[PDB]
Amino acid sequence: VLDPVSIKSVCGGEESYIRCVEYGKKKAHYSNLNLLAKAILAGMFVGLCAHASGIAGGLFYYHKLREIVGASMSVFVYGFTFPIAFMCIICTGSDLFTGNTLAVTMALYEKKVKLLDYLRVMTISLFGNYVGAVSFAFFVSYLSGAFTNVHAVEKNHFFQFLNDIAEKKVHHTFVECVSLAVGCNIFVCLAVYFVLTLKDGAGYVFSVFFAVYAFAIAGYEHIIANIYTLNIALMVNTKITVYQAYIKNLLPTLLGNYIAGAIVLGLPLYFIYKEHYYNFE
Amino acid sequence: PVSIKSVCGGEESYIRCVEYGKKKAHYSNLNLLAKAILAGMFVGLCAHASGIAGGLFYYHKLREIVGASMSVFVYGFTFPIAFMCIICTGSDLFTGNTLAVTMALYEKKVKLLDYLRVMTISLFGNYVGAVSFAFFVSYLSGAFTNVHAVEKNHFFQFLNDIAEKKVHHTFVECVSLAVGCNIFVCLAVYFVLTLKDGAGYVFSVFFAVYAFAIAGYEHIIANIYTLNIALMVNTKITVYQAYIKNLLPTLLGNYIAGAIVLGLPLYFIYKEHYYNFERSK
Amino acid sequence: PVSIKSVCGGEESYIRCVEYGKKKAHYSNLNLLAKAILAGMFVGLCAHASGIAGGLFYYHKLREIVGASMSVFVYGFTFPIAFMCIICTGSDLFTGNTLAVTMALYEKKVKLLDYLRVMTISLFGNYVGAVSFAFFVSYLSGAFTNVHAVEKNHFFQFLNDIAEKKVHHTFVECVSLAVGCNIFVCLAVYFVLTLKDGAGYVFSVFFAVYAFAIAGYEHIIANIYTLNIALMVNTKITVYQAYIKNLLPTLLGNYIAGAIVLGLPLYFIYKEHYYNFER
Amino acid sequence: VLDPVSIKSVCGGEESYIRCVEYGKKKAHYSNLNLLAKAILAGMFVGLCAHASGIAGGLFYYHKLREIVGASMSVFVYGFTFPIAFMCIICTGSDLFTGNTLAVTMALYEKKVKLLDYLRVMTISLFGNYVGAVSFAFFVSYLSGAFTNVHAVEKNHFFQFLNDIAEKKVHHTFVECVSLAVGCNIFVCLAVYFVLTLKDGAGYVFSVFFAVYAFAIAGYEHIIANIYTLNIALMVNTKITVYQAYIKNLLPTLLGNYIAGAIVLGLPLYFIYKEHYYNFERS
Amino acid sequence: VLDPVSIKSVCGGEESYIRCVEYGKKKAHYSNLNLLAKAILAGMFVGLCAHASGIAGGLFYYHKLREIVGASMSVFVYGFTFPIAFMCIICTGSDLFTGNTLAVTMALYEKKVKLLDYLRVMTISLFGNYVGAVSFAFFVSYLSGAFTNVHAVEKNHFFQFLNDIAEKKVHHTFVECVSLAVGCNIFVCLAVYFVLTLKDGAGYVFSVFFAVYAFAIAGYEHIIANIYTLNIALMVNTKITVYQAYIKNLLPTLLGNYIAGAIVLGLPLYFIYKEHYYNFER
Ligand SMILES: COc1ccc(C(=O)/C=C(\O)C(F)(F)C(F)(F)F)c(O)c1
Ligand SMILES: COc1ccc(C(=O)/C=C(\O)C(F)(F)C(F)(F)F)c(O)c1
Ligand SMILES: COc1ccc(C(=O)/C=C(\O)C(F)(F)C(F)(F)F)c(O)c1
Ligand SMILES: COc1ccc(C(=O)/C=C(\O)C(F)(F)C(F)(F)F)c(O)c1
Ligand SMILES: COc1ccc(C(=O)/C=C(\O)C(F)(F)C(F)(F)F)c(O)c1
């Protein structure tokens, strides 16, 4: 007789929360240089995926097509290309600050990591991701000339795409950018939760694919992606200024993300699963 | 190799649904409220993403050729992430309860007071989460504001048109559409219990929710978010035309689909199997 | 790690099909009717969703450029979830039974009277489910009502044109198309029987269902729903055309495909393998 | 306890070679009529999937769409819907000549099958696939009237798509058709290898889908699909001749496909993995 | 009764690094002929998938369509069709130079391979991929006429797409070509890591699919794809020159792909997982 074995590749409820807490408290045990290296690699991967998505969007930001689709196909394609960043980050074992704003905050709420340790991890991850992203921007994208102003509408679709995304990201106000970053980090935290839950390749790919595509097309502000995009837009001499790039956007973006991951998502999840995490431990 | 299966039969899926509904009636009130609020917030967030994508594909010059088609298709492609954002974190939505908890009430595993308390708390929490996300994120972000310029005002136009379409049905029409919506939603809930592999977990629910959204059926929580955002953004709808015209018939149709349309036939089909299962323990 | 196999050779698939057919000849008449009606309801729901999507992509300005290609493609994209709905709820349609139960008939595991019970009840219940959904949900939804304005009439126009296409074949053509449809459905049943993984379950049947849908092959239960809702919304078709001209040929072709096209050859192939498995 | 057991579904390399050789050797012991039936069933499945792909491509061959898109969308949809023939064949346990060219040839290289049996298997598979494909082309396509000349540019796009594909397939010279068939059978045997190394259902589906879609879009010639398409085109009275169908596309396509299955892939893999196979047999 | 076994098919980070080092070491023992055959087969597969991608892009390079969408549709379709190559390489057991620039370089850093062995394997893989790709560009692509210059513009879309792609690849400078190569191979090495960490068919297909499509659409330059494309362009008499192929694109491409495989990725991951591998081997 045939007796195939019934197997579950997914979990839920308290299991995912406990795994998230464990993943968070794991990171504070690394040394400063290991954390720096991981953050640098994550920032570089984000920059690579962002460059690829920008090339695709500029491809679909073409002069004549844009007059019909009005910048719709380009954003869809950019959001279709970006998600692979999650695979790059997770498979290499590197971490991104946006995910940490949930994982390490959860670990801290349970009182696994300490406040100074949390500060160390957050600061190192942020710095590493930032310098990784800007280094990739320069060395790969800026020197490749892929985003240079050609001064000819027929060929300048990539530069125009970058300029238009930068202007969109730069002409918000404080509160609107904060809100967009909140939504961004909600999506990112949900994606990390998904991978923490769906312990299979299919889920690992597609759940975070849909999450990242949704937050990319939606227009939510991601701190690392915004750092890369704003820096490279500055490099290729778009209309955005450095004061605009940093004060207007990246400060409210970091904040929104921080709130989304720590207060909006971490605190109620902790309130829900505190007793379960205790019972497991 | 060892032969395995991640898919169970209908009897086992019915048992799993009954148990999943039963367990709902043991959480304290505050945890149920928190989980319902989280589910409502997730639905509002994914609806915001879907609406922004649809508006992007609602470009005024693209309308003239494919009017309302690409925008709706993209909205239905983007929305289904909410099912994952709910399941992977243990949150619950009223719609899936309208099947699971009533099925657990049929088999005598819940009590009437318990059932009504659970349903009321779930609905109120979902409402709070959805409206809170709508206001804060969507309306402090200016994403759907009126720009008074046809070339740029496609997000507002898409939202206004969807809101009018929703609030211009009749009672019977809306009841039928909500019935269809909840049949799809509860069928996806059944899928996530019969399929225990990540690939199925994502894709079955994706297809179900996409068919829901494209078919124009009516979902109570998504409707709450959409009409509240259409009211603060000041489209051409009215508070009465929102609540009385859509959500009351929508809620009634959703509950009918959950409890009567599918709950009773499944109960009659599988009550003997459940009784035997119980005799086995 | 550990080496795991999620598939079966095909002899095991044949044994699984025979056992699946044998199982459903044991339920009560009422349980069978309930499952058949739920299956009909599911197919009606998915047909409604796919028809609405096709109507949306039937907009007249887009239609003047792309014909009906986009509408048909999107309808085929939306339809397939019906397989998931039926399989996950434990219900059956006539089309799948044409293979599953006819196999157990050949293998002597089901008797003629029980086979006729299963077949008749499945057909009647699927009919009841389809028409009831068509009335209660589709007709009262007003989605496919004739809004004479040409620009909003795409939903009605799509259904009208599809109904005309279905009812304007000849006997032989409709029988052939139904044969193709039921061959695809039986192959999807074999797919789910063979692939015990979520990815398999979803995609193997998704592609097959979309293929038969776009190909213009005729499904008896989907045809029932479409023709009944077309009559409800007052398209150009007649009841005589709906039933005599299309439905009877469609049923005949689907049964022939499920019973003689795939049943007899697979039996002649795997009869010894099943004999030994029974040992 | 949170300790799921680690599993792997892809076990490739030497193991895939063993699986291919044993799958080729299993075909040796089946009776003649069993192989004949399996071949006929596979040919019918190919005919069905090719009919579906042709109808979809014709649907996207609308003349107004054509004058702004050419055939690109039509071929894209054709290759998007065709790939289910592989699943139809493999799930039901039938055999196709193109996929046999690798496995049965490899089992003959290892001296597991004998030359007489190998010739029997190849001949029966080819003949049965021919019968199945032509039978589906007549009894399910010609009678369905789906590909019929309507004589209206608005409605005749299915017949026009089929006619254009047929004319394209019968204007190659010997060398070009042989080359395209070589590419096609490389893709087909490679899909067979992927299915032999993937045992999840997910890869089982999508690896095959991508391989067959690439082969279809690239224009590589598949012998079985070519018989189906050319026969249905002749039945409907397209701008084509039986000479152009058989002595200008089918023979070179068969030769190229067989060479790709047996020489381009095969002997290479034999050289790579025969010592590993010998060690396996020592076990 | 109802109690499925919890299973995971994914183990990233540390385990992926260990498996990468082991995979790198496994190459340093194959015989010269075996490695050459594997590299030739991999080059042949890359040529086949590049030919299919080019044909699809040429289909979607129709002059009327191109006049509206430019080259967006053709590039997307090429990126959709190409990723199948990874599947060919992994399932056949063959090897490609670009993934070796990480795997074998890692096995060298850990000292599981020697320097002579590493250089031999790397050069053999490169030469075999060269021979396979060129033999496919001749015996399959050129001899089929699929990319012939059929002057009439209505049908001359495959040739025009190939010509424009070649002109794009040929008209960079040293630094830009090197950077785009660095990007391509970071993507290829990440796809290899995806394959090594995910041990299920779904991930196998889809992670590498997305990585390869992202690299291809992004315009990043792959040495094996570059050789195939430029050789077939030379064969079909495009506007590029014999010198412009090798001294303008393939030399910088190879350089940058090697940098990506070895220093950009290899050094940080080594500095991350060195002591953990030390632990794992004791
Ligand atoms: C290792 O576990 C993880 C995995 C992913 C992230 C993450 O945050 C990734 C992004 O934010 C992103 F930008 F790459 C994308 F949105 F694309 F996913 C993380 O922090 C930790
Ligand atoms: C078993 O865990 C679940 C998962 C999902 C739901 C649910 O209700 C989902 C929807 O309602 C939805 F898909 F329509 C959307 F989320 F988009 F709103 C649920 O009730 C319970
Ligand atoms: C094993 O559980 C099942 C699942 C499906 C069927 C079936 O028959 C499917 C169709 O008929 C269909 F594909 F046409 C559609 F689903 F669209 F209705 C069945 O018989 C049994
Ligand atoms: C039983 O295991 C198999 C599986 C597949 C084939 C095969 O050959 C498949 C094709 O050739 C194909 F994909 F091109 C199409 F089906 F489309 F024709 C085979 O021979 C044997
Ligand atoms: C056997 O394990 C592998 C599998 C694949 C590669 C590889 O490198 C493949 C490519 O580079 C490529 F050409 F297919 C693409 F550029 F698309 F990625 C490898 O090195 C080792």
Domains assigned to chain B: 10-280 (1.20.1080.10)
As a whole number of Å, the end-to-end CA separation of chain A is 41
- Report how far residue E55's alpha carbon sits from residue E71's, in angstroms, rounded to the nearest whole number: 14
How far apart CA B273 and CA B271 sit, in angstroms, is 5
Partner-chain contact E70 A65, CB within 8 Å = yes
SS3 state at C152: coil
Bridging pattern class, strands A5-8 and D5-6: unpaired
Give the C-alpha separation, D60 to D77, whole Å. Answer: 8
Residue given tokens 């939760």 in the structure block: A193
Tokens of C71: 């509408």
- Helical ranges in chain C per DSSP H: 11-23, 29-56, 60-66, 69-78, 81-89, 94-106, 112-133, 140-141, 154-167, 171-194, 198-199, 205-214, 220-233, 239-240, 248-256, 263-277
Length of chain C: 279
Single-letter amino acid code for the residue at A166: A
What sign results for the dihedral spanned by CA atoms E129, E132, E137, E141?
Answer: negative
Interior angle at CA A228, CA A222 and CA A230, nearest 5: 90
DSSP label at residue C8: -
* Extended strands (E) in chain D: 5-6
Q: CA of C212, closest CA in chain E: separation in Å?
A: 24
What's the one-letter identity of residue C22?
K
Q: What is the widest separation between alpha-carbon atoms in chain A?
A: 72
Tell me the CA–centroid distance for residue C171 and ligand 3, in Å.
24
CA distance C36 to chain E (A): 27
> How many other CB atoms are found less than 10 A from the CB of residue B113?
9
Q: Collect all residues with Cβ–Cβ distance below 8 Å to E102 and sequence separation of at least 6.
A: E20, E185, E189, E192, E193, E261, E262, E265, E266
Instruction: Determine contact: D201 vs chain A, CB below 8 A.
Output: no
Could you tell me which chains touch chain A, where touching means 3 or more CB pairs under 8 A?
Answer: B, C, D, E
Separation in Å, CA E216 to CA A187, C38, D244, E125: 27, 47, 39, 22
Smallest CA-to-CA distance from A257 within A156, A201, A200, A181 is with: A181
What stretch of H or E contains A54?
helix A32-59
Residues A252, A259: Cα–Cα separation, whole Å: 11
- C204 within 8 A of C231, measured Cβ to Cβ: no
> Tokens 């794009």 — which residue?
E168
Q: Could you tell me which residues come within 8 angstroms of residue B278 by beta carbon, excluding any fewer than 6 positions away?
A: none
Q: Which one of the ligands is nearest to C50 CA? A: 3
CB D212 within 8 A of CB D251: no
Rounded to a whole number of angstroms, the CA Rg of chain A reads 20
Cα separation, D116 vs D154, whole angstroms: 54
Is the Cβ atom of E89 under 6 angstroms away from ligand 5? yes
Mapped onto helix, strand or coil, the DSSP state of residue C128 is helix
Helix (H) or strand (E) holding A202: helix A201-218
Q: What's the half-sphere exposure (Cβ side, CA atoms, 13 Å) at E37?
A: 17
Shortest Cα–Cα distance, E274 to chain A (Å): 11
Residue E131, CB-side half-sphere exposure with 13 Å CA sphere: 12
Query: How far is Cα of residue D141 from the mean position of the Cα atoms in its chain?
Result: 19
- Under a CB-based contact definition with an 8 Å cutoff, are residues C162 and C144 in contact? no
C59 with B73: Cβ contact below 8 A = no
Q: How distant, in Å, are the alpha carbons of A240, B246, C4, C233 from that of B169?
A: 47, 8, 52, 17
CA of E261 to the centre of ligand 5 (A): 12
3-class SS letters over A79-117? HHHCCHHHHHHHHCCCCCHHHHHHHHHHHHHCCCCCHHH
List E residues 7-66 in contact with D (Cβ-Cβ < 8 A). 7-9, 11, 33-34, 37-38, 40-41, 44-45, 48-49, 51-53, 55-56, 59-60, 62, 64-65
Q: Are E233 and E196 in contact (CB under 8 A)?
A: no
Kindly give the number of the ligand 1 atom that is closest to the alpha carbon of A88.
14
Which residues in B lie closer than 8 A to residue A198 (C-beta atoms)? 88, 198, 201-202
> Which residue does chain C place closest to E8, by CA atoms?
C1
Question: CA-CA distance, D59 to E63, in Å (whole number)?
Answer: 22
What angle, 0 to 180 degrees and rounded to 10, lies between the N-to-C axes of helices E32-59 and D267-282? 130
d(CA B270, CA B265): 9
Q: Given CB atoms, is A202 within the 8 Å cutoff of chain D?
A: yes
Decide: E129 and E46 in contact? Cβ < 8 Å. Answer: yes
Q: Say if the Cβ atoms of E269 and A64 lie within 8 Å.
A: no
| E strand map for chain A | 5-8
Residue A221 DSSP class: P
Q: Give CA A27 to chain center in angstroms.
A: 18
Give the experimental resolution in Å. Answer: 2.2
**Residue A163 to residue A185: CA distance in whole angstroms:** 24
The span from the CA of D229 to the CA of B40, in Å, is 54
Q: Are C278 and C14 in contact (CB under 8 A)?
A: no
- Which residue type does A155 have? K
Distance CA E272, CA E268 (A): 6
User: What's the Rg (C-alpha) of chain E?
Assistant: 20
Determine the Cα–Cα distance for residues E102 and E262; give it in Å rounded to an integer.
Answer: 5
What kind and span of H or E run contains B163?
A: helix B154-167
List alpha helices for D137-265, DSSP H: 157-169, 174-197, 202-218, 223-235, 242-245, 251-259
Residue B78 CA to chain centroid, in angstroms? 14
Discontinuities after residues in chain B (C–N over 2.5 A): none
Cα–Cα distance between A153 and C230 in angstroms, integer?
Answer: 51
Q: How far is CA C202 from CA C80, C98, C198, D184, in A?
A: 9, 22, 6, 28
Dihedral sign, CA of C35, C36, C41, C45? Answer: positive
Task: Please report which helix (H) or strand (E) contains residue A211, including its range.
Answer: helix A201-218
> CA nearest C176: which of D147, D48, D143?
D143
CA angle C168, C174, C177 (to 5 degrees): 125
* Residue to mutate (ligand 3; options C23, C93, C223; most atoms within 8 A of CB): C93
State the DSSP code for B4.
E
Structure tokens at B245: 């015209």
Q: What number of H helices and E strands is found in chain A?
A: 15, 1
∠ CA D188-D192-D197, nearest 5°, is 145
Give the span between the Cα atoms of D16 and D23, in whole angstroms: 10
| Alpha carbons C148 and D54: distance in angstroms, whole number | 35
Q: CA–CA separation, E165 vs C70, rounded Å?
A: 30
Both structure tokens of D10: 């892809």
**C119/C259 Cα distance (integer angstroms):** 12
Write out the two tokens for D4.
Answer: 């799921």
Residue B195 phi/psi, 5-degree rounding, is -95, 125
The residue written with tokens 């007003």 in the block is: C142
Residues 6+ apart with CB under 8 A from C99: C17, C21, C186, C189, C190, C258, C259, C262, C263
Question: Which protein residue has the closest C-alpha to ligand 4 atom 2?
Answer: D90
As a whole number of angstroms, the distance between CA E90 and CA E192 comes to 9
Residue D262 tokens read as 């047996």
Tokens of D77: 């949809």
Q: B205, B175, B193: which is closest to B266 by C-alpha?
A: B193
Closest CA to B38 of D91, A31, C210, A186: A186
Give first-to-last CA distance, chain D, whole Å: 38
**Contact flag C196-A4 (C-beta cutoff 8 Å):** yes
Name A119's Cβ contacts closer than 8 Å, sequence gap at least 6.
none
The end-to-end CA distance of chain E, in Å, is 41
CA distance linking residue D45 with residue D92, whole number of Å = 10
Residue E7 DSSP SS3: strand
Return the ∠ at Cα E212 (arms to E207 and E216), rounded to 5°. 150
3-class SS at D7? Answer: coil
Kindly list the residues from chain E whose CB atom is less than 8 angstroms away from the CB atom of residue A204. Answer: 10, 198, 203, 207
